[model samples]
Target: SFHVILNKSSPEEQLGIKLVRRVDEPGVFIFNVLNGGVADRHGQLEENDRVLAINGHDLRFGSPESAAHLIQASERRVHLVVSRQ
Candidate 1:
């Protein structure tokens, strides 16, 4: 697991990673990371990475929509913790 802080331009700005809900799992998982996106630029997050928390908020049992909300919910610094698959 690892943590990273991303600086967002706008509240609507994408975090640069695509997320999905696994039928066999509970929390959201990274499906892909956009090239040149903030997360990619950060160089820590990767595809299949399971998000565990956001801004210190636990998300192991959270839904994809909830994870997306947490990501887009931040306007400036967005903190994330993820476990790699």
Candidate 2:
């Protein structure tokens, strides 16, 4: 288990990571990361990891759409706690 924080340079900056969540799964997964993007620039996130939180908000039981909402609601910082499994 680990965590990563990505900074949004501006309102136009994308966090640069693709997310996925299996219908029967608990947390969202890092499906992919854009090259040289915000999450990639952070250099701590990787594909297939389960995201457990955002800005300290619990995501273990959250939906992908809900996760998107929480992420979009973030301002300068996007904090994620994730697990490898």
Candidate 3:
């Protein structure tokens, strides 16, 4: 797994990656990447990637709600660790 840190200038800012929960899995995964979004601009994260954590907070068995909260609570930056396989 690797990390991607995105700076969110505003509370309404978007990370640019869509998140989905698999019925057979325990963690959230990237569903799609929006063009020109923060994640897209960063170019490290990708669609279908499995999210491992955010800001060092483990999402091994975490829900989308918790992940969203972490990002929203970031001071100005959001840290994400994801795995391609």
Candidate 4:
């Protein structure tokens, strides 16, 4: 598990990733972290890692939509708590 920060100067900037809930899982996961994108500078955050919280807000059992909502709402900086395989 690790904590990473993603920040953008403008609201128009993309987070460079997606949040989704697997069909058989209740946890929110990092759907994608494609390259050429602003990734975890240290490469800690990765595809399919379980996201335990965002901006200090935790919703382990929440839907992807709500998770995505928070991600977009946090237009400046986002604190991600992630757990990997």
Specify the highest-TM-score model's number: 3
Instruction: Kindly list the per-residue Cα lDDT of model 1 for residues 17-67, writing each as its tens digit.
Output: 888998886888989999999899988887888989999889899877888
User: Model 1, stretches more than 4 Å misplaced?
Assistant: none
Better of 1 and 4 by TM-score: 1
lDDT of 4 by residue, 1-85 (tens): 6888888668666667777778886898888876756664546678888888888888678777777778779768878887888
lDDT of 3 at 72: 82
Candidates 1 and 2: which is better by TM-score? 1
Candidate 3 vs candidate 4: the TM-score winner is 3
**C-alpha RMSD of each candidate structure in angstroms:** 1.2, 1.4, 1.1, 1.8
TM-score of each model, in listed order = 0.90, 0.88, 0.91, 0.83
Worst 10 residues of 1 by lDDT: 63-72
What lDDT score belongs to each candidate, Candidate 1 first?
A: 0.86, 0.82, 0.85, 0.77
lDDT for each residue of candidate 3 in 21-58, tens digit (9 for 90 to 100): 89987898989999998889888887899888998999
Q: Which pairs clash (backbone N, Cα, C closer than 3 Å) in model 4?
A: none
| Residues 1-85 of candidate 2: C-alpha lDDT, one tens digit per residue | 6878777888557788888878766778888999989888888888988889998889888767777777888878888888895
* The candidate that achieves the highest lDDT relative to the unseen native structure: 1
